[PDB]
Write a protein that binds this ligand. Structure first.
Ligand code: AMP
Length: 632
DNA sequence: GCTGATGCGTC
DNA sequence: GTCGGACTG
DNA sequence: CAGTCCGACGACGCATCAGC
């Protein structure tokens, strides 16, 4: 009985402690009971082990369900570059729920907002019990339902799913659709749990499996290490082929050990991008790399563009998330041929797309960049031109460069490509360990419009193996190598109820500057981070008192999300941020830099209260108007 | 056929 | 993109 | 102490669908 299924048990025997029949279909209730047991717990290690247990039973018992089960725990419809979308929102989900509960949208709505978890507002001849595999496909059905009137159709399935739910199934199905599963394990851990499962109870065995715990006899530490070694195998592979549709069947078919031999990098499938650690300044950069020659480069403020040239001539570009941006970029593709040497048969390029002034001949702001149509490659309709900045070469003429040093890689890159100003050009690099030198670069970097500096090592810990270290590169961000970036004092003019972790307190706030010509507090931006847990809990108390049933006459939100609660304006906070932009939603300093747009803060973060300031001695609209003005 | 509201991806 | 908190190394 | 990993939260602008 799956209602008693307990993947968190001790001496879990895959065959025995399973709660379905061999070769039969994995029950969702099993998947939910697992989710339950994981959430019961804090130890990531315990959580992975539990997930592992369901997994080992899936492998041993019902291999074809492994994929669905994985996707379910990952809460994803499928491969990134397939771009499936639930297309339910909160509100659709909401009405679905109210319908199924025989409640009214409001009561339901209220309860969800307050409890901060749709899953709880979520809980005759009921259908047969929900199958793990069935649930996923129903999800995939919802997603597929597009175009006109499709919403009611989407609602139909959800409600069905709900009426079908047997125990806690409801809440978990609710959260999934809500896009807020809250499991505590995502890609790494699920990857982890998969590796373990497949390592402890291998696929391929006639039933029942004569090898049920490959770890037996290993001491604990021993079993740990061994497990982590196996882990890296799967983990590095997914990295080059981050696509379960691909991995799993191969895994199941050849086992973890030989997985790599049968799953490789190939242009046309996106691979996971190398990431970056934030650095507190040159000091620490030199320390981290204090025994490793490194390079410096401009951190261009564009979007990342993985360029794939297939030997057959076609070419696909992917986002930081393996999303298919081919189509975004008709202009890029036609320019591909003049980008490479004749001998170059195939390549995978690491690049930033940047908004470009073919006229003024200069990098335009990232906002400019975001103005291009996403879908159509009506290549003539391109109002905003783009320039690619190259900085890495993953793969070249049949061969993967993944296991090569940045040195080798970059060299190959320069040696085989051909730049054209404002079209395609190598990132400005600098090779030093000189403190002042670096600082100089950093300033020139912002002086040529760049977030600042990337710092990468050249031949020490310097390959493209993300499984060893994703954030393997460092960024020096003007912010604190400056000393202290844009920072304002703003007035808290309303809270928003928080969810999940933020559940049951305030999740966020609405902040206003002070316009004195209007003599009113203009909502500037929302604020949702920077505070500690404690800090928050303290905030929740005081502000609680200040909740008013209406706004003050001097408060001006417009386009802004009506606070959940309106606060009595008194709290001034001190906020940092990376930049400024003309908001089409924010009144603060409207008319001052734009005739229409106000301005907001970019990457806003709470820093501390200024318990001396009153809201009128907050930061000022022309003060903001000032800051924005200085930006360019 | 248009407007507003929100999805969903970019940072 | 930004951020803290629990848990491991 | 440091690094992992997960999930709270930001402003924006194109795309999409309901309701008119
Ligand atoms: O801030 P972040 O953590 O999102 O930074 C990583 C991103 O920075 C962009 N970028 C710009 N220039 C470079 C160079 N020269 N090297 C590596 N990344 C660079 C990328 O879009 C990256 O995802």
């Amino acid at each position: 009985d799956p209602s008693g299924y307990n993947p968190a048990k001790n001496n879990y025997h895959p065959v025995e402690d399973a709660c379905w029949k061999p070769g039969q279909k994995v029950p969702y209730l099993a998947v939910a009971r697992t989710f339950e047991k994981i959430e019961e717990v804090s130890a990531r290690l315990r959580m992975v082990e539990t997930l592992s247990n369901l997994l080992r039973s899936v492998v041993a018992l019902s291999p074809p369900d492994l994929l669905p089960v994985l996707y379910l725990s990952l809460n994803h419809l499928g491969p990134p570059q397939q771009g499936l979308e639930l297309g339910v929102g909160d509100g659709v989900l909401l009405k679905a729920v109210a319908q199924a509960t025989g409640r009214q949208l409001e009561s339901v709505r209220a309860e969800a907002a307050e409890k901060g978890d749709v899953g709880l507002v979520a809980e005759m001849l009921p259908p047969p019990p929900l199958t793990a595999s069935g649930v996923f496909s129903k999800f995939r059905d919802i997603a597929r339902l597009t175009g006109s009137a499709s919403t009611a159709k989407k609602i139909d399935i959800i409600k069905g799913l709900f009426v079908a739910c047997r125990h806690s199934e409801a809440r978990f199905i609710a959260r999934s659709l809500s896009g807020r599963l809250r499991l505590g394990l995502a890609e790494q851990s699920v990857l982890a749990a998969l590796s373990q499962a497949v390592s402890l109870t291998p696929p391929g065995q006639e039933f029942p499996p004569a090898m049920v715990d490959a770890g037996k006899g290993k001491t604990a530490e021993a079993r740990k290490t061994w497990l982590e070694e196996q882990g890296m195998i799967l983990k590095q592979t997914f990295c080059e082929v981050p696509d379960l549709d691909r991995i799993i069947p191969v895994l199941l078919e050849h086992g973890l050990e030989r997985l790599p031999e049968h799953c490789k990098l190939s242009p046309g499938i996106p691979l996971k991008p190398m990431l970056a650690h934030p650095t507190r300044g040159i000091s620490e950069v030199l320390k981290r790399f204090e025994e490793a020659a490194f390079t410096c480069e401009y951190k261009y403020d564009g979007q990342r563009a993985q360029i794939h040239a297939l030997e057959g001539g076609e070419v696909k570009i992917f986002s930081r998330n393996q999303e298919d941006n081919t189509g975004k970029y008709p202009d890029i593709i036609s320019r591909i041929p003049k980008i490479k040497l004749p001998s170059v048969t195939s390549f995978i390029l690491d690049t930033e797309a940047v908004a470009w002034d073919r006229e003024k001949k200069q990098i335009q702001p990232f906002q400019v960049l975001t103005t291009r149509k996403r879908k159509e490659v009506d290549a003539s309709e391109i109002q905003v031109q783009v320039c690619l900045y190259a900085f890495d070469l993953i793969y070249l003429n049949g061969e993967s460069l993944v296991r090569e040093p940045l040195s080798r890689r970059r060299q190959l890159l320069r040696e085989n490509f051909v730049e054209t100003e404002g079209e395609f050009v190598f990132a400005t690099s600098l090779d030093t360990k000189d403190i002042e030198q670096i600082a100089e670069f950093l300033e020139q970097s912002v002086k040529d419009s760049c977030e600042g500096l990337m710092v990468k090592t050249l031949d020490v810990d310097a390959t493209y193996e993300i499984a060893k270290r994703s954030h393997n590169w460092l960024k020096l961000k003007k912010d604190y190598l400056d000393g202290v970036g844009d920072t304002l004092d703003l007035v808290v003019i309303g809270a928003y109820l928080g969810r999940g972790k933020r559940a049951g307190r305030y999740g966020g706030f609405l902040l206003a500057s002070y316009d004195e010509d209007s003599e009113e507090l203009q909502a500037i931006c929302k604020l949702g981070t920077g505070f500690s847990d404690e800090e928050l809990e303290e905030h929740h108390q005081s502000l609680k008192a200040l909740v008013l049933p209406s706004p003050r006459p001097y408060v001006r939100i417009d386009g802004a999300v009506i606070p959940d609660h309106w606060l009595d304006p008194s709290a001034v906070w001190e906020v940092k941020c990376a930049d400024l932009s003309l908001s089409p939603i924010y009144p603060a300093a409207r008319g001052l830099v734009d005739s229409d747009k106000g301005i907001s803060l970019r990457f806003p973060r709470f820093i501390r209260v200024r318990e001396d300031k009153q809201p009128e001695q907050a930061t000022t609209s022309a003060q903001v108007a000032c800051l924005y003005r200085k930006q360019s």
